[PDB]
Coordinates of C-alpha atoms in Angstrom, one line a residue:
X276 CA 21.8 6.8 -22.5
X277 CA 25.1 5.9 -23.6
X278 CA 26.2 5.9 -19.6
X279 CA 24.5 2.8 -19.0
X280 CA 24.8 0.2 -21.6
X281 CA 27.8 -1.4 -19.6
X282 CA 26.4 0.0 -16.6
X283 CA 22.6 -1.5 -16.9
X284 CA 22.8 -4.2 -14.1
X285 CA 18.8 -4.5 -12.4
X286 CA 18.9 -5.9 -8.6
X287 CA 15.5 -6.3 -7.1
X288 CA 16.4 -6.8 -3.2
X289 CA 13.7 -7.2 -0.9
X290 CA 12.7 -10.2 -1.8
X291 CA 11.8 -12.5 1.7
X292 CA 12.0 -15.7 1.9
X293 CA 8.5 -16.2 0.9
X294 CA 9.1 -14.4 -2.3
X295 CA 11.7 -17.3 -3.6
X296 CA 9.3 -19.8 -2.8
X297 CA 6.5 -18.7 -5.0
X298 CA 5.7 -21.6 -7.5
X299 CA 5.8 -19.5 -10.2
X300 CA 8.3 -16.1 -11.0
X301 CA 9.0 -14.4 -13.9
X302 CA 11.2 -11.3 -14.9
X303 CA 8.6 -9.4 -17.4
X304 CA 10.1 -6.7 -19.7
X305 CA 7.7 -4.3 -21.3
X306 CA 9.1 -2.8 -24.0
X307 CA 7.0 0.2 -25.0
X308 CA 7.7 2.3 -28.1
X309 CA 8.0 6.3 -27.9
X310 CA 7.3 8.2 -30.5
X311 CA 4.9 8.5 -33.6
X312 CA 1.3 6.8 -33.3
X313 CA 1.2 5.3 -36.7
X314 CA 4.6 4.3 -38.8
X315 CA 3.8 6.3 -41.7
X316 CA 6.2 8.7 -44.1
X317 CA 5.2 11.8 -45.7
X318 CA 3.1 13.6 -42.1
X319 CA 4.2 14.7 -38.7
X320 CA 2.8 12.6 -36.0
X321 CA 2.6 12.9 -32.8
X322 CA 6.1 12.0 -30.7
X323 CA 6.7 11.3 -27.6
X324 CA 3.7 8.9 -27.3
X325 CA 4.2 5.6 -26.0
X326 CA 2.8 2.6 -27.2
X327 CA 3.2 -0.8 -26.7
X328 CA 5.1 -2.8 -28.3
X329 CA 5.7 -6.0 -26.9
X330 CA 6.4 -8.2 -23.5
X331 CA 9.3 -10.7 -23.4
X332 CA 8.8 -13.5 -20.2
X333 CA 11.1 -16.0 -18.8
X334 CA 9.8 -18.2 -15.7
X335 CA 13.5 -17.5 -13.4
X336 CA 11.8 -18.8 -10.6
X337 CA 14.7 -21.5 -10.6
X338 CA 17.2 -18.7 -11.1
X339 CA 15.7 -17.1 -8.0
X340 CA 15.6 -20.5 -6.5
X341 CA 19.4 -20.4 -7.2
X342 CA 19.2 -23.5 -8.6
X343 CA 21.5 -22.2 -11.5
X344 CA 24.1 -19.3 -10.2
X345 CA 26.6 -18.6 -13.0
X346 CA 27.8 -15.1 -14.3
X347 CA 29.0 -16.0 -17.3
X348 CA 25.3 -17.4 -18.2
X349 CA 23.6 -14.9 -20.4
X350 CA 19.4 -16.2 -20.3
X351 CA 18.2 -14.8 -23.9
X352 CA 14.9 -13.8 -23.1
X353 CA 12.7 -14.2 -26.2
X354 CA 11.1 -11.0 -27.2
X355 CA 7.1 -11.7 -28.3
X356 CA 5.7 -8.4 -30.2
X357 CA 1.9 -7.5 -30.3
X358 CA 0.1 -10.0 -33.3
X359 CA 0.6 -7.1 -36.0
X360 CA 0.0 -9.7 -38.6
X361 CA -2.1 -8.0 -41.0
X362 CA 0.5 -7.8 -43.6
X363 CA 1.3 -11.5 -44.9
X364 CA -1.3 -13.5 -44.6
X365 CA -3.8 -10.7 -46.6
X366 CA -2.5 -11.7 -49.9
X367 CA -4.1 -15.5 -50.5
X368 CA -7.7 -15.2 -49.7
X369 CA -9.9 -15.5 -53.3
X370 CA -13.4 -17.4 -54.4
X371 CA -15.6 -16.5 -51.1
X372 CA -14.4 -12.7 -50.1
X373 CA -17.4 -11.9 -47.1
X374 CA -15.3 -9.6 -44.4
X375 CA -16.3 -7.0 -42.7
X376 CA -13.3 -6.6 -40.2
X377 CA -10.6 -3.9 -39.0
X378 CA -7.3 -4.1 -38.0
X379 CA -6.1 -4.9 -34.0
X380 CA -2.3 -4.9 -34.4
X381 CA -0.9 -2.5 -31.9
X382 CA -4.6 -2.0 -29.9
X383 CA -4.0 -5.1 -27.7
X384 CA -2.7 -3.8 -23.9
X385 CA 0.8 -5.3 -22.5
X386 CA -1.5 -7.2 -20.2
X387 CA -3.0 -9.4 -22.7
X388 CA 0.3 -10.0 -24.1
X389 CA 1.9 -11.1 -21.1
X390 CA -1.0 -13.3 -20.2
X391 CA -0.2 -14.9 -23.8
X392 CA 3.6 -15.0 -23.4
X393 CA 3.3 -16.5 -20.1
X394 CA 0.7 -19.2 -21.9
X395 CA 2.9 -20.0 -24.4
X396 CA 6.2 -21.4 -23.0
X397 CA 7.4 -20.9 -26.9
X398 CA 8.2 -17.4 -27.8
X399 CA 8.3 -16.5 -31.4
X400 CA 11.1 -14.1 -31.0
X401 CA 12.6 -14.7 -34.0
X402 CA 16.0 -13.1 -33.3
X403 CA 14.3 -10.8 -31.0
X404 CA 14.9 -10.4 -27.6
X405 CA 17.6 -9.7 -25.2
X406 CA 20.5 -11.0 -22.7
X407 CA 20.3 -10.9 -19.1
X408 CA 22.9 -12.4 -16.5
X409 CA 20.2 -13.7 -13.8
X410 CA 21.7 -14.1 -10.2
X411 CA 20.5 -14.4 -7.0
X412 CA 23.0 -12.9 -4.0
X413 CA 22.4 -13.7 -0.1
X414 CA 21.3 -11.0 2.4
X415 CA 20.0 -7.1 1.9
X416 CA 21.1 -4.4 -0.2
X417 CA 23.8 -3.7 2.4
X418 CA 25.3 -7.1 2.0
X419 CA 24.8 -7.6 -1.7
X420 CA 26.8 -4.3 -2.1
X421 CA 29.3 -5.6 0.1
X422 CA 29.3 -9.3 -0.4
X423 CA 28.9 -8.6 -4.0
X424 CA 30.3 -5.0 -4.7
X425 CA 31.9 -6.6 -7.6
X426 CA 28.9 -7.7 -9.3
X427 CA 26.2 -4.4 -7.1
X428 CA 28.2 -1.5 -6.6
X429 CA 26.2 1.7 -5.7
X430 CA 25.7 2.7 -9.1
X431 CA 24.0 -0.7 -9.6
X432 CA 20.5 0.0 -10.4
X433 CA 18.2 -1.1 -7.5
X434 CA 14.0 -2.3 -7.3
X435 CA 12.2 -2.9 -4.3
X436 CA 9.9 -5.9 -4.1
X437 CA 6.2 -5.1 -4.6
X438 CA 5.0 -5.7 -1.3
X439 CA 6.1 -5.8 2.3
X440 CA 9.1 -8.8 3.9
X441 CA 8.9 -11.1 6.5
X442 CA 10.6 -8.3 8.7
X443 CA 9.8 -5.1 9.5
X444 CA 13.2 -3.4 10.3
X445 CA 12.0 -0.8 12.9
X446 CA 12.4 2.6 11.1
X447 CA 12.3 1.2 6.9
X448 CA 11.8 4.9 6.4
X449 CA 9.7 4.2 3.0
X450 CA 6.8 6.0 0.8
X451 CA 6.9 3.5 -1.7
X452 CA 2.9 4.8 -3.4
X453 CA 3.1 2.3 -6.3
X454 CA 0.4 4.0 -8.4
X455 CA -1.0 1.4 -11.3
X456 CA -3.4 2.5 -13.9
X457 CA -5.8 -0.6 -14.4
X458 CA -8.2 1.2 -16.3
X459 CA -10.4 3.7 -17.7
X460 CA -13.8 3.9 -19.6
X461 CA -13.6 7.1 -21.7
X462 CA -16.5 8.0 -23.9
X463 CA -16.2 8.7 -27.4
X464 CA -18.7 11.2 -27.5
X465 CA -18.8 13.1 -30.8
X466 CA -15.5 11.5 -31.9
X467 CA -16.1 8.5 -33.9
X468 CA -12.7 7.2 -33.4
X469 CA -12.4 6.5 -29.5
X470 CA -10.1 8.8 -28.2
X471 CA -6.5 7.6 -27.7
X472 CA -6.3 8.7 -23.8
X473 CA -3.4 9.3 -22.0
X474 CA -3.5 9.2 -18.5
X475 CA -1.3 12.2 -17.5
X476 CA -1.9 11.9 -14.2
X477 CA 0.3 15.2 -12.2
X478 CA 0.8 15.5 -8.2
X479 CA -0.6 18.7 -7.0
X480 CA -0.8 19.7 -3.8
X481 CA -3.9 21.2 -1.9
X482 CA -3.2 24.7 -3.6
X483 CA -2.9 23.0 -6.9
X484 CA 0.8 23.6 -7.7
X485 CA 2.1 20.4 -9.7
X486 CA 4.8 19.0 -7.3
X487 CA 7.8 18.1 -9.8
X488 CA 9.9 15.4 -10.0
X489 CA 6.8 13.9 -8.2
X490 CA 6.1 11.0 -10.3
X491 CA 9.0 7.7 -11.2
X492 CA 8.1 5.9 -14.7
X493 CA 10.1 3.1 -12.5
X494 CA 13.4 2.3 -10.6
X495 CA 16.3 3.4 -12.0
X496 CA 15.0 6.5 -12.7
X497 CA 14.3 10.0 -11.8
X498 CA 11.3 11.3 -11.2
X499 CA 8.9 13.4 -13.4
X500 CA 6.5 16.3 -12.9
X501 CA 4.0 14.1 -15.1
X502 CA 3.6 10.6 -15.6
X503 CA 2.1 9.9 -19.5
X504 CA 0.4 6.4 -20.1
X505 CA 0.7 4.0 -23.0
X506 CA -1.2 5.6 -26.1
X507 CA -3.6 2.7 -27.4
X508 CA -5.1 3.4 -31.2
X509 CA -8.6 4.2 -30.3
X510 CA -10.1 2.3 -27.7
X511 CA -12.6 3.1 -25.8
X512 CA -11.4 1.3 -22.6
X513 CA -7.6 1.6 -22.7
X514 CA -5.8 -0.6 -20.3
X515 CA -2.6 0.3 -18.9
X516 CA -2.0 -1.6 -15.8
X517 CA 1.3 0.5 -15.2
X518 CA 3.2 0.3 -12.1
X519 CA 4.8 3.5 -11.3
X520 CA 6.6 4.9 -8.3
X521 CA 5.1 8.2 -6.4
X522 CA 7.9 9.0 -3.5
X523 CA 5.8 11.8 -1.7
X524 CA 7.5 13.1 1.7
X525 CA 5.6 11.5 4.7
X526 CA 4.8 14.9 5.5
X527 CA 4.1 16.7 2.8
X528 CA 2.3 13.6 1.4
X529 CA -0.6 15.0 4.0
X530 CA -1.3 18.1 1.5
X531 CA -0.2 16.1 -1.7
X532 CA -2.9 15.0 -4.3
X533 CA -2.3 13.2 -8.1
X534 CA -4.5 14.9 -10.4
X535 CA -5.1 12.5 -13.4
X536 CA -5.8 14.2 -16.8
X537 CA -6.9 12.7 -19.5
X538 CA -6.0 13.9 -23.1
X539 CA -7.6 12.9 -26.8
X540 CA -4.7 12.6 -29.2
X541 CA -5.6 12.7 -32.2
X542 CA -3.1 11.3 -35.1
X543 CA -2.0 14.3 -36.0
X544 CA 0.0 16.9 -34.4
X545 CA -1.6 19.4 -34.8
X546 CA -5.5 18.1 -33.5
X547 CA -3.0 16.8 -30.6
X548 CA -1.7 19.9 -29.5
X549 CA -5.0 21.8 -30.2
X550 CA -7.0 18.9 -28.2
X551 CA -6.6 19.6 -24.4
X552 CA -7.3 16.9 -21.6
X553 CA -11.3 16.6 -22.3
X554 CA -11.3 15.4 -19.2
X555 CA -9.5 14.9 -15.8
X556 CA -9.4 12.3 -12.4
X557 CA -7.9 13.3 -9.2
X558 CA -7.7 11.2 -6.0
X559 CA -6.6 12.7 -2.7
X560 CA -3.9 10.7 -0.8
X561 CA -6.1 11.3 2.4
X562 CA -9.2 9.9 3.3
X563 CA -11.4 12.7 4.7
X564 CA -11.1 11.3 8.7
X565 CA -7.3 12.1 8.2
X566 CA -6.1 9.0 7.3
X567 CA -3.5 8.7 3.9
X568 CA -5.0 6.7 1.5
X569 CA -6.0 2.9 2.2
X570 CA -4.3 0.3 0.3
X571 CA -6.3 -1.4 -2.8
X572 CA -8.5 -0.3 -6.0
X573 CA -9.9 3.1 -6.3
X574 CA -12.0 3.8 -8.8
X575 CA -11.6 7.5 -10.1
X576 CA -14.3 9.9 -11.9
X577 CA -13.9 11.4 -14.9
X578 CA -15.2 15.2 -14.9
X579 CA -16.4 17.3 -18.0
X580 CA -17.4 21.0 -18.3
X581 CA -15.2 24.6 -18.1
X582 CA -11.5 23.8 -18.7
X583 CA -10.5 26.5 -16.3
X584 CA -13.5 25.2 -13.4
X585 CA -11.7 21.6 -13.5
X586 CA -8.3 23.1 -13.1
X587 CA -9.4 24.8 -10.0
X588 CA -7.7 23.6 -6.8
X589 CA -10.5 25.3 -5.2
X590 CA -13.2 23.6 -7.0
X591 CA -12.2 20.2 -8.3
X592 CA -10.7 19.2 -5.0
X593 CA -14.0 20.1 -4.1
X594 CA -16.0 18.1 -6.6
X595 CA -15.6 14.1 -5.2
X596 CA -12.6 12.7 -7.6
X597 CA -13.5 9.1 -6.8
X598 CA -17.1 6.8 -7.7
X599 CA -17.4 6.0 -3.6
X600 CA -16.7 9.9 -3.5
X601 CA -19.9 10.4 -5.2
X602 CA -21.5 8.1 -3.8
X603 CA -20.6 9.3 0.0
X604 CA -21.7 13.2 -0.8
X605 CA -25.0 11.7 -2.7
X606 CA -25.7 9.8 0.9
X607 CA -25.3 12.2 2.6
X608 CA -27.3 15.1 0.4
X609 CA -29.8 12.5 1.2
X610 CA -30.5 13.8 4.9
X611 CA -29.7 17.3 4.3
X612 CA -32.3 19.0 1.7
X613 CA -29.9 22.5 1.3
X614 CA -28.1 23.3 -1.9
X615 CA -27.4 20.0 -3.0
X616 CA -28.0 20.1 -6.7
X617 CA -26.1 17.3 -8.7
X618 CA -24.5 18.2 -12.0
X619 CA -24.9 16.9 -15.2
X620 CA -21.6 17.0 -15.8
X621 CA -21.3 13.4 -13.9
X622 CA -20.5 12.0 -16.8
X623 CA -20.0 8.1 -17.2
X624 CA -16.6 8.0 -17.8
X625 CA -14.7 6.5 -14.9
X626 CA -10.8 5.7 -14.0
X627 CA -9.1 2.7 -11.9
X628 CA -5.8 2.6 -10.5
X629 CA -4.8 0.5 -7.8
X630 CA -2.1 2.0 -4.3
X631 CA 0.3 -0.4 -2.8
X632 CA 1.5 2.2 -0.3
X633 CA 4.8 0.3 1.0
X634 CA 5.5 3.3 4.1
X635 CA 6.5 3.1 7.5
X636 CA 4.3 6.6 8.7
X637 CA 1.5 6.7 6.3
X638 CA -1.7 5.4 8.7
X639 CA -5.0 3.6 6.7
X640 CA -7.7 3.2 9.6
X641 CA -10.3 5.3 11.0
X642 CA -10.4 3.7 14.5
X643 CA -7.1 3.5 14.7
X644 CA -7.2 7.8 14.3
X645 CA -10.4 7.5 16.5
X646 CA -8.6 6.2 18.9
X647 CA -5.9 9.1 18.4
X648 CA -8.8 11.1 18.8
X649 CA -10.1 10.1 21.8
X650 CA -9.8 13.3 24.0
X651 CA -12.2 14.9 21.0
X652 CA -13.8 10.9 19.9
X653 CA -15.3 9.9 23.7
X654 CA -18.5 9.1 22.3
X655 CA -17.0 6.3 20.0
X656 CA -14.1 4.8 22.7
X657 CA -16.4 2.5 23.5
X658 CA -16.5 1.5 20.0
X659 CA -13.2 2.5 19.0
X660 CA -11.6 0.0 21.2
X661 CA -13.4 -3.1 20.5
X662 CA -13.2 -2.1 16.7
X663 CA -9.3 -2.2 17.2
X664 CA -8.6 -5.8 17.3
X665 CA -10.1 -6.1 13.5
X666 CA -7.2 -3.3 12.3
X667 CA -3.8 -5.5 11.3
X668 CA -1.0 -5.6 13.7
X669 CA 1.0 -3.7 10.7
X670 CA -1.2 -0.7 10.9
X671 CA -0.5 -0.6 14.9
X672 CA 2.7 -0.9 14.8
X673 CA 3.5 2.2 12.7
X674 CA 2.0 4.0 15.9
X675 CA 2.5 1.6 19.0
X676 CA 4.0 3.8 21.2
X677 CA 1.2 6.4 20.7
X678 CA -1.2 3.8 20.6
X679 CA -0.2 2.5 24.0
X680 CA 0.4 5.9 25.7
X681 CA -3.5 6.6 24.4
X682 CA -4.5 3.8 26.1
X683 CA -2.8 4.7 29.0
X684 CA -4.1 8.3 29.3
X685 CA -7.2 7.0 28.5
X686 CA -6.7 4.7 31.7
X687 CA -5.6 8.0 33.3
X688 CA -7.9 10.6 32.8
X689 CA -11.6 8.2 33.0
X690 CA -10.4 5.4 35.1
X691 CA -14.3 5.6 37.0
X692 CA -15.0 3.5 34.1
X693 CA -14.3 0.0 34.5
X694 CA -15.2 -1.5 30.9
X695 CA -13.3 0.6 28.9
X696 CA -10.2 -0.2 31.1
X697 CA -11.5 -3.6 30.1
X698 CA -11.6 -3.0 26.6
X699 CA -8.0 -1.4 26.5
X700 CA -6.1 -4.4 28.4
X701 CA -8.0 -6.8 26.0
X702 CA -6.5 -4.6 23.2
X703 CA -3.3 -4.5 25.0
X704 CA -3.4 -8.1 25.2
X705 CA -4.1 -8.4 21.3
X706 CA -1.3 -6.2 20.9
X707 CA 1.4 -7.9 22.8
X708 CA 0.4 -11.3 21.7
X709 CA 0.4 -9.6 17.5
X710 CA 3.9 -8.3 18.6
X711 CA 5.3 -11.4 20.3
X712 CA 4.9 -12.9 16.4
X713 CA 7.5 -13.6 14.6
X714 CA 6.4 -10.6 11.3
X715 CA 6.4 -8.1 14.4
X716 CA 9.1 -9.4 17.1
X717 CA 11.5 -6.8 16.0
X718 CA 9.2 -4.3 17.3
X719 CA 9.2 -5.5 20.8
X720 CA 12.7 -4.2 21.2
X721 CA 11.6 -0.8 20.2
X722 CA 8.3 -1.6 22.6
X723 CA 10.9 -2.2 25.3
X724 CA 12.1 1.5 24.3
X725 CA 8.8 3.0 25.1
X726 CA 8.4 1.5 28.5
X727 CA 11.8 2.0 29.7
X728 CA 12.1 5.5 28.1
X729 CA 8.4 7.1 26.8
X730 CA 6.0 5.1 28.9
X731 CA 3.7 8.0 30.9
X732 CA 1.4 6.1 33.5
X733 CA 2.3 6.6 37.3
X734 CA -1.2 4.8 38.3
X735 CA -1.9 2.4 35.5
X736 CA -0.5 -0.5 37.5
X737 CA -3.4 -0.2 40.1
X738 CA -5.3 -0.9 37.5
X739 CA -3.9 -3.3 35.5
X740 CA -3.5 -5.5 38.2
X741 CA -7.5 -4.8 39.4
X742 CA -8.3 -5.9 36.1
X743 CA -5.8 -9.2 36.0
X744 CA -7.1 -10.1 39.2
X745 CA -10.8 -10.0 38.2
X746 CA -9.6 -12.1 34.8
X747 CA -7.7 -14.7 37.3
X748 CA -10.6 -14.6 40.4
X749 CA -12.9 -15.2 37.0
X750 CA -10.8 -17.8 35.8
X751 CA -13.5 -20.4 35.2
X752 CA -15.1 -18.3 32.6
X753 CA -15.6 -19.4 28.7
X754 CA -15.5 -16.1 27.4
X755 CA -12.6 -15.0 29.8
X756 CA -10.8 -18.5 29.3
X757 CA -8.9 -17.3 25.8
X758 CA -8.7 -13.7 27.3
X759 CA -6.9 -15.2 30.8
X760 CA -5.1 -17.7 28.2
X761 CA -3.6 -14.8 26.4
X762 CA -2.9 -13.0 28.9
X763 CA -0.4 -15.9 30.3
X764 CA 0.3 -15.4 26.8
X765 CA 1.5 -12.1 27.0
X766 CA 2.6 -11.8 30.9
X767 CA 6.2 -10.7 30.9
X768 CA 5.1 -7.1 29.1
X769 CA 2.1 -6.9 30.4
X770 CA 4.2 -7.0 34.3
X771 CA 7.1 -4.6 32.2
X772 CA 4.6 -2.0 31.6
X773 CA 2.9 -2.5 35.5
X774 CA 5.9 -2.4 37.2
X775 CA 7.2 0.8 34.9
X776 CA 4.4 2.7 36.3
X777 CA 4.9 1.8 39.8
X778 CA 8.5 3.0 39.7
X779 CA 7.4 6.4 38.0
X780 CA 4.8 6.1 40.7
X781 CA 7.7 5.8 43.1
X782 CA 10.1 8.4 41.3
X783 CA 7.1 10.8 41.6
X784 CA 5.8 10.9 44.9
X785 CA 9.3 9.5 46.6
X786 CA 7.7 7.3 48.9
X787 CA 5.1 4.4 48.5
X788 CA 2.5 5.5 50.8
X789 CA 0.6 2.7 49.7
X790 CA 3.7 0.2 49.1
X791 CA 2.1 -2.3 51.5
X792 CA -1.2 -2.0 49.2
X793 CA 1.2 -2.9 45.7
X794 CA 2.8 -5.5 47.9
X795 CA -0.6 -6.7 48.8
X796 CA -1.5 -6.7 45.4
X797 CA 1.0 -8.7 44.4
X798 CA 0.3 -11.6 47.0
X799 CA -3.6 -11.2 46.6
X800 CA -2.7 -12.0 42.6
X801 CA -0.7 -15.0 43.9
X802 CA -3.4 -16.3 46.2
X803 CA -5.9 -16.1 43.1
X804 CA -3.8 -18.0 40.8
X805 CA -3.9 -20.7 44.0
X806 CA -7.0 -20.4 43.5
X807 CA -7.3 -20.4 39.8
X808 CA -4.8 -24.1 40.0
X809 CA -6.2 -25.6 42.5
X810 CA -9.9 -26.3 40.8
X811 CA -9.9 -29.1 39.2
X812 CA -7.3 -29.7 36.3
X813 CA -10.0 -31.0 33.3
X814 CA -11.6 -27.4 33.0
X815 CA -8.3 -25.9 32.6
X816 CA -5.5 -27.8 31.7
X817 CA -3.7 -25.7 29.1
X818 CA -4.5 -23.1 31.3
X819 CA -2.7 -24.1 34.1
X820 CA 0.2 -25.0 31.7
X821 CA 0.2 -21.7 30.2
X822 CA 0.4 -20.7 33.9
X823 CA 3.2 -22.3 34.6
X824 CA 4.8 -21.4 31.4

């Protein structure tokens, strides 16, 4: 593109202040080749195909240290190409000729390269390589545009960091799916050369309809209807490893699906062209309770049989894309004997590929849905809400509010039931005291919206302070000592949310007709913590500090 040779300037913002202190950092270039498979004269090939050609490494962890900060600095990184030395060295070998060998020149993925370039602190580049003007500049995207609009205007390419900051801005409207193809185990079948698969992996949605422009190769680039994977020369497990980004609306994410197909390409054009995908992955975005896709490895199925049958929105979405997929129908044919007949075509060919889902919306928990099912889930509450405190603060907080007025309604509708008003407050507690951290204090502004603003309860402050009483009248407790502790611990919401309820209480009914029984409340709490302090101090010392803090 001849639009961006003076205009190819790479920011990666994002990057907390745990990422600069990593020990070790390095700005990896893949360079991958498009075009013919084999660099012959006299035959069409294939082009279009891409396949690798080297990795070129430089540890900037001290340029992202800011140790060195100079724009006139132009780091050469040294280029390392794949070992394709089968050329030179083939000409001196006489007197004991015994090989039986092949060639692995170009066969080698970019992982195994970089692992080697990273190794060797020397790079052969030869005269090969590249220059790069490494700097690190203060503050967000907003601030390095405008601190630095010289150096990142908004045509200044711009990367996110792989992962998640040290602050959650309430609202980072983001759907970063990071879709990496680890690997896949393809069989060779009747083909004696493995099969140079491509992972063409294509977002369709539950109708089948490829969603274009679905699929970015990476930043500074548009996206693609179809994303094509490095070609590697016949092997039967090709290894990619390629990060990708898959910017699926929130919304429409619900009903959106990558279908990974998986094409033989043959040397020639021709054999290409007339080889179709033999066979194809697919991996819904949702897990089947309603959830989007959990963060980590999935490990995809291969499918072989009818061309058209595999194609079939209707049917492959059907058929279970991933091995656990297989694994959960095969359970569960297990108890039911009717019309549960496996197929052969369960081949042995499998696919990897790993989901850093970096959104604000997209939800990864089944309690945590359970939960949001509870007016149709009542038979689980009970364990829904002690299975709470395992999910991560960072899943809650997507859907505190909703959470909270669950719990509350909850609270409202079954309040007979004292132990699951126990469990929620314990939950509550876990979730002030998660929020009151330092990764999720931001949110506690936006918490402070929902009480002053969406908060529902006009009776949950009865409650609550029942409950609080019965923690502080059972103060002496083991087991209630850290739930008591973190209750202190958590206090001034905790009395936010009571006292928001009692004013609704008041701004719906008018009156207190039982004013003098919250005011009674309220001393009967004080004389308990009288009673709490004034047992003796050894029991409960950093309880009674606590108390007083």
């Amino acid at each position: 593109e001849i639009e961006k040779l003076n205009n190819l300037q790479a920011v990666f913002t994002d990057l907390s202040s745990m990422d600069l202190i990593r020990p070790r950092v390095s700005l990896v270039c893949q360079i991958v080749r498009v075009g013919h498979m084999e660099l012959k004269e006299g035959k069409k090939h294939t082009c279009g195909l891409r396949r690798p050609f080297g990795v070129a490494v430089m540890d900037i962890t001290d340029i992202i240290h800011g140790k060195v900060d100079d724009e006139e600095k132009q780091h050469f990184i040294p280029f390392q190409q794949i070992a394709m030395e089968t050329y030179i060295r083939q000409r001196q070998l006489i007197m004991s000729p015994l090989i039986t060998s092949h060639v692995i020149g170009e066969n080698e993925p970019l992982t195994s390269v970089l692992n080697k370039v990273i190794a060797a602190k020397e790079v052969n580049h030869k005269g090969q390589g590249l220059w790069v003007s490494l700097k690190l500049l203060p503050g967000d995207l907003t601030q390095v545009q405008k601190n630095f609009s010289h150096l990142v205007d908004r045509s200044t390419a711009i990367a996110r960091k792989m992962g998640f900051p040290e602050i959650i801005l309430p609202g980072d409207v983001r759907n970063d799916i990071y879709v990496t193809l680890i690997h896949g185990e393809f069989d060779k079948g009747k083909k004696k050369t493995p099969k140079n698969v491509e992972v063409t992996m294509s977002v369709h949605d539950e109708e089948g309809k490829l969603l274009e422009k679905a699929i970015h190769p990476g930043a500074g680039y548009e996206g693609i209807s179809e994303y094509k994977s490095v070609v590697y020369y016949q092997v039967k497990q090709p290894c990619w490893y390629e990060t990708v980004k898959v910017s699926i609306a929130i919304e429409e994410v619900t009903r959106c699906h990558i279908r990974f197909t998986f094409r033989h390409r043959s040397s020639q054009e021709t054999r290409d062209k007339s080889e179709r995908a033999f066979g194809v992955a697919f991996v819904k975005l949702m897990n089947p309770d309603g959830t989007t896709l959990q963060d980590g490895r999935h490990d995809l199925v291969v499918y072989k049989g009818d061309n058209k049958k595999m194609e079939d929105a209707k049917f492959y979405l059907t058929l279970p894309g991933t091995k656990m997929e297989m694994e959960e129908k095969e359970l569960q044919a297990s108890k039911n004997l009717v019309t549960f007949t496996p197929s052969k075509d369960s081949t042995k060919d499998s696919f990897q590929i790993a989901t850093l889902i970096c959104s604000t919306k997209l939800t990864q928990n089944v309690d945590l849905l359970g939960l949001l099912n509870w007016r149709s889930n009542s038979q689980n509450i009970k364990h829904n809400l002690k299975k709470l405190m395992e999910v991560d603060g960072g899943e809650i907080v997507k859907f505190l509010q909703d959470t909270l007025d669950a719990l509350f309604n909850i609270m409202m509708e079954m309040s007979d039931s004292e132990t699951y008003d126990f469990l929620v407050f314990d939950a509550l507690v876990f979730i002030i005291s998660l929020i009151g951290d330092i990764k999720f204090q931001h949110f506690n502004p936006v918490l402070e919206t929902y009480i002053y603003k969406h908060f529902s309860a006009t009776l949950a402050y009865v409650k609550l302070s029942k409950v609080l009483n019965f923690y502080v009248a059972n103060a002496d407790d083991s087991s209630k000592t850290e739930l008591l502790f973190a209750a202190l611990k958590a206090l001034k919401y905790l009395f936010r949310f009571i006292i928001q309820s009692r004013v609704l209480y008041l701004r719906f009914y008018g009156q207190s007709k039982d004013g003098d029984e919250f005011n009674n409340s309220i001393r009967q709490l004080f004389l308990a913590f009288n009673m709490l302090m004034d047992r003796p101090l050894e029991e409960a010392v950093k309880i009674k500090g606590a108390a007083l803090k």
